[PDB]
Ligand binder design. Structure first.
Ligand SMILES: CCCCCCCC/C=C/CCCCCCCC(=O)OC[C@H](COP(=O)(O)OCC[N+](C)(C)C)OC(=O)CCCCCCC/C=C/CCCCCCCC
Lengths: 48, 151, 52
């Protein structure tokens, strides 16, 4: 072969946007859950 | 009165579960099985924050639960081991009045309605500051004076 | 050496001024019996009440 082969991160297709979409959605739902838990802790930290 | 139940252990009573409104109050630090058979079978939701275990009273058959109230004007109250006096944000008693093993005893006002349930006390010399689970207009609260031990 | 020394001394002076501000904005609440420090000011000035 008249080229080279290296690690995955720089070889994924431009249609790797599926990876970005799934990861971003999961990160968003996790961040929302964490924010809700932080808010609930805040009032529970002020009600005592 | 006489609406309370002792939570029994192998050989002695360690605390007292009180019936208030529609909830079976019970402090969480005390452990046992409760004397009355039916009450032992209810699902007791717990909370380490307020040191409580409560469950819906079988109100279809228990129509004798104590009345309650949310206002706590400063004055004098009674808790079946003497009279509790209010001051500031503390409950005080004669030093020897309180004893371990009688935690969860409801304390009433002059009209026969509970206002707080004692969890423990701190001996301040002449007086003993009571750590109680009371409630304001909306939600419960746990007033815990410094150095209060469980009972 | 001079630049590093003064800059760390500048941040030390800043943290000292912050501590002095905390002291002078918290001592009135410390002296007063009753201890009604609000939740917001406790969080801002990093203090805790006697019932928590
Ligand atoms: C809807 C969504 C659609 C999107 C899907 C996207 C597709 C996902 C794709 C990835 C594409 C990968 C392409 C890149 C591959 C090129 C990498 C490379 O160039 O390499 C190839 C070499 C060549 O093979 P060889 O025969 O020369 O080597 C073996 C020698 N022999 C045979 C003697 C043993 O193969 C090797 O050597 C590899 C040997 C090591 C490989 C194992 C990796 C170990 C990783 C462990 C992770 C641990 C988990 C971490 C959890 C921690 C908790 C946080």
């Amino acid at each position: 072969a008249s080229h080279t082969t290296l690690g995955v991160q720089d070889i994924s297709v431009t249609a790797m946007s599926w990876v970005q979409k799934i990861t971003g959605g999961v990160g968003l739902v996790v961040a929302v859950a964490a924010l809700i838990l932080i808010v609930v802790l805040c009032v529970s930290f002020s009600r005592h | 009165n006489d609406c309370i139940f002792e939570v029994k252990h192998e050989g002695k009573v360690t605390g007292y579960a009180c019936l208030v409104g529609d909830k079976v109050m019970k402090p969480a630090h005390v452990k046992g099985t409760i004397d009355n058979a039916d009450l032992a079978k209810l699902a007791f939701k717990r909370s380490s924050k307020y040191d409580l275990e409560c469950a819906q009273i079988p109100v279809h058959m228990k129509s004798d639960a104590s009345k309650f109230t949310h206002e706590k004007p400063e004055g004098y109250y009674n808790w079946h081991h003497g009279a509790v006096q209010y001051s500031g944000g503390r409950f005080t008693i004669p030093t020897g009045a309180g004893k371990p093993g009688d935690s969860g005893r409801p304390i009433f006002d002059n009209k026969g309605r509970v206002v707080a349930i004692v969890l423990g006390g701190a001996n301040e010399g002449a007086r003993t500051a009571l750590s109680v689970v009371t409630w304001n207009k909306d939600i419960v609260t746990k007033i815990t004076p410094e150095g209060a031990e469980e009972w | 050496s001079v630049a590093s020394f003064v800059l760390l001394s500048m941040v030390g002076v800043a943290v000292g001024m912050c501590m002095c501000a905390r002291r002078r904005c918290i001592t009135p609440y410390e002296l007063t019996p009753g201890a009604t420090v609000p939740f917001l000011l406790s969080l801002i000035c990093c203090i805790r009440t006697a019932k928590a």
